[PDB]
Amino acid sequence: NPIHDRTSDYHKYLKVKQGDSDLFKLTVSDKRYIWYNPDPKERDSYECGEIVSETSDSFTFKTVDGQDRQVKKDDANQRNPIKFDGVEDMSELSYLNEPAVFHNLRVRYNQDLIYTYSGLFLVAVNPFKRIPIYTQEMVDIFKGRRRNEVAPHIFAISDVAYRSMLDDRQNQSLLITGESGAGKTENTKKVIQYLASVAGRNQAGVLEQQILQANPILEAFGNAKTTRNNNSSRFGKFIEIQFNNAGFISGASIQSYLLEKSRVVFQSETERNYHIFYQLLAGATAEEKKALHLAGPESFNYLNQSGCVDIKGVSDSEEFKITRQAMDIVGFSQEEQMSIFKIIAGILHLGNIKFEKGAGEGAVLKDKTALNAASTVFGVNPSVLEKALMEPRILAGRDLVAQHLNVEKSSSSRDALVKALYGRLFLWLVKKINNVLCQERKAYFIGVLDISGFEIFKVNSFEQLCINYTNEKLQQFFNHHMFKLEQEEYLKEKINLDSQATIDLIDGRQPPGILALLDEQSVFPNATDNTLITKLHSHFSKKNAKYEEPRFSKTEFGVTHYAGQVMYEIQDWLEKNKDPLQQDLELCFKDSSDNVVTKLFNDPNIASRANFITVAAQYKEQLASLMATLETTNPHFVRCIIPNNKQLPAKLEDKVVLDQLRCNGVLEGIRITRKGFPNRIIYADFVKRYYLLAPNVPRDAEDSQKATDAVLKHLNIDPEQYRFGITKIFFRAGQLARIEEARE
Ligand SMILES: [Mg+2]
Fold it and tell me: Which residue windows are transmembrane per the record?
């Protein structure tokens, strides 16, 4: 039992190493410390200052330099006694201030202990290196163990959700959010790997194989290299792991959101297009290439702009194999696989189209090779395509007339065509996969939500508002949930707001919110970004307290989010909301001779949204559904945190980290918690550590509750500082630290 074997890898990688003795005596010391800012030029940079003296109202402590400063007791961030250094649950700390919290996280992280609880949360910090704690062996240790019985681990919360599902006969949810590169997806894959094991139908598994093989498929199409993550997820997802009344995996379903279709036509420097592009180009057989008119990435416009065409220690060729492999296992037919690859190719071809002017103002195609190539793989008619691109027929009321798009207009159209194809192909992929895994007759499920937390970038656009909108709802969801659970707890032992405004500003109907005004402008073909922003400011500037019209910028506005103020840029929102594609383009492709292509343009479930609804309306709608589902589950929350902005191990940056804990609900949670009775200990537990503090008690006593009172009494503790619970002694902030600080 590696849990009891101090030499196992379990101990080594997941636990603070334990010595011989456990005696209270060991950690004894007369020094009392404080957390301070070496200078407010910072604020998250703190240093330990030892209290050299104090007054009835404040503390005097020396700095690192040996400089004596003074602080108000009421403004002091006292340091927890060394015993608390490394605890598995932040809720275990007596002094619960920010620096303290970071400290505990740091201490653990300096031992490569990437996982820590914080009350209801599991906090996970990316190590940025490998930690072999995800073996089958590792899997085996977490089986059926209580949270309190084992080290913190993604496997632990996975086991807890699984058991609750079986014990309560209630669906479950795991929300894993945070910053790009934080490790959401990796953790999400662990969750599934664990479930697949503890609930998979042994012997050897197939359904399970299919399930496992799904991600790989999706990652190839929805993940790309960005400056923040080599394997960034460019879409959000909710994974539903389906179980039967017996607790055996019976299927799964996937819901995808917000795919960055734009990445197909443009990538920042150093970044890469979607993995598959590279996979195909590298892995395709010298024969398939010829049939696909494939060349190197350099020879393609959509792959030769960022300067990066490969990932460090990544074989696109070998990845391709993996990718086809999965396709094979899920069930994609060889034909289907071709068309997909054909779509991939054709897209590349479309991007290699060069529109030229001259003649007049209207676009022309001197060379048609690219066009020919894309038409062949797509299996459409080049002439129709050509026309559809440069001369779409447009309705001017009663008049349906073909226009002569200029180059720019022509090009954007091509781009629109490419993005429509990519996104629909993605949608189709998901649907196919679901057809194979999904069960219309599940008993229970565990859903995993792997999506980014709030996004606060240099530049924030429509997509950011969206994800930011989702996060307001998720955070509100946590808050409500934290409310009920804390209430229960206090009630089982015998003891004793804010997000809607932001949400309403965004999705309200009457008065109309941001999204509603967006939609309204959306009907007007001639509306512009300016008409739009004016409208916005016109309804909220100085009117809505969550809204801010910029001092000078004419294209932005801010919203006060849970995380803080975010400044948004309006450019192209109108276009994003409609996501237009020239009708003739639809017509061209509707006649495709390709079997997959036909589906993308002929299946209303794939070729359209909802007369039809806007992109905003659909986002709202899909978010409501999502929330509805979650509502019906018992949720579990995982906060993946990025130690720094450089993808470096052993480099935990206080400011980077702290800003993440600020925005993700962790510090709030603590603040709230710290205000009541943060520390809640089991009687026996308490006595077992402190018995020697009172001339009365023996380590293991039968009347633990009485024994507790004894010490307390002995120590003459302030009655309002604690609360006798049915099975726990509840302590207010700092109390337990002091007690700890008591002499034997
Ligand atoms: Mg991801």
Answer: none
Kindly list the catalytic residues.
180-181, 185, 229, 232-233, 453, 455
CA–CA dist 646, 230 (Å, integer): 12
Cα(258) to ligand 1 centroid in Å equals 13
Instruction: Report the interhelical angle of 275-283 vs 214-222 (nearest 10°).
Output: 100
Distance CA 239, CA 447 (A): 5
Q: Amino acid identity, residue 328?
A: D
Using the mean position of ligand 1's atoms as its centre, give its distance from the Cα of residue 221 in Å: 13
Instruction: Determine the distance separating the centroid of ligand 1 and the alpha carbon of 185, expressed in angstroms.
Output: 4
Q: Report how far residue 462's alpha carbon sits from residue 618's, in angstroms, rounded to the nearest whole number.
A: 13
Q: How far is the CA of 450 from the centre of ligand 1 (A)?
A: 7
Q: Cis peptide before 511, with omega less than 30 degrees from 0?
A: yes
Which one-letter DSSP state was computed for residue 543? T
* Burial grade of 287 (CB within 10 A; 0-12, 13-18, 19 or more): exposed
Q: In terms of residues, how long is the chain?
A: 744
Q: Distance, CA 43 to ligand 1 centroid (Å)? A: 30
462 vs 566: CA distance, rounded Å: 12
- What does the alpha-carbon distance between residue 232 and residue 184 come to, in Å, rounded to a whole number? 10
- Report yes or no: 5 and 724 within 8 Å, Cβ to Cβ: no
Contact 217, 171 (CB under 8 A): no
Q: 503 CA distance to ligand 1 centroid (A)?
A: 25
Beta-carbon neighbour count of residue 402 at 10 Å? Answer: 13
Among all chains, which residue has been given the structure tokens 């998250």? Answer: 44
In contact, 350 and 411? CB cutoff 8 Å: no
**What would the two tokens of residue 428 be?**
């189709």
**Which is nearest to 175 in space by CA: 644, 617, 629, 661?**
629
Annotated binding-site residues read: 178-185
Continuous H helices in 142-198: 154-164, 184-198
Q: Quick one: CA dihedral 143, 148, 150, 155, positive or negative?
A: positive
Number of C-beta neighbours around residue 310 at 10 A: 13
- With left for phi above 0 and alpha for psi between -120 and 50, is residue 86 left, alpha or beta? left
CA distances from 288 to 291, 338, 379 (A): 5, 9, 16
Count Cβ neighbours within 10 Å for each residue of 659-698 and write b for 16 or more, e otherwise. bbbebbbbbbbbebbbeebbbbbebbebbebbbbbbeebe
Which letter does DSSP use for residue 132 in this model? -
Residues 528, 531, 537, 540: is their CA dihedral positive or negative?
negative
236 CA from centroid of ligand 1 (Å) = 8
Q: Are the C-beta atoms of residues 737 and 685 closer than 8 Å to each other?
A: no
Distance, in Å, from the CA atom of 143 to the CA atom of 162, rounded to the nearest integer, reads: 10
Domains of the chain as residue ranges with CATH: 32-79 (2.30.30.360), 87-271+440-454+634-675 (3.40.850.10), 272-331 (1.10.10.820), 333-439+580-609 (1.20.120.720), 459-579+612-633 (1.20.58.530), 677-744 (no CATH)
How many other C-beta atoms are found inside a 10 Å radius of the C-beta of residue 612?
10
Q: What are phi and psi of 690, to 5 degrees?
A: -115, -5
Q: Which residues pair with 547 in a beta bridge?
A: 559
What residues contact residue 482 under an 8 Å CB cut-off, 6+ apart? 119, 120, 669, 672
Task: Kindly give the distance from the C-alpha atom of residue 690 to the centroid of ligand 1, in angstroms, as a whole number.
Answer: 46
Distance separating alpha carbons of residues 723 and 346, to the nearest angstrom: 70
315 by Cβ neighbours in 10 Å (0-12 / 13-18 / 19+) ranks as middle
Which experiment gave this structure? X-ray
Q: Supply the Cα-derived Rg of the chain in whole angstroms.
A: 30
Neighbours of 270 (CB within 10 A): 11
* Residue 158 to residue 194: CA distance in whole angstroms: 7
| Binding positions for ATP | 178-185
Three-state helix/strand/coil letters over 202-238: CCCCCHHHHHHCHHHHHHHHHEECCCCCCCEECCEEE
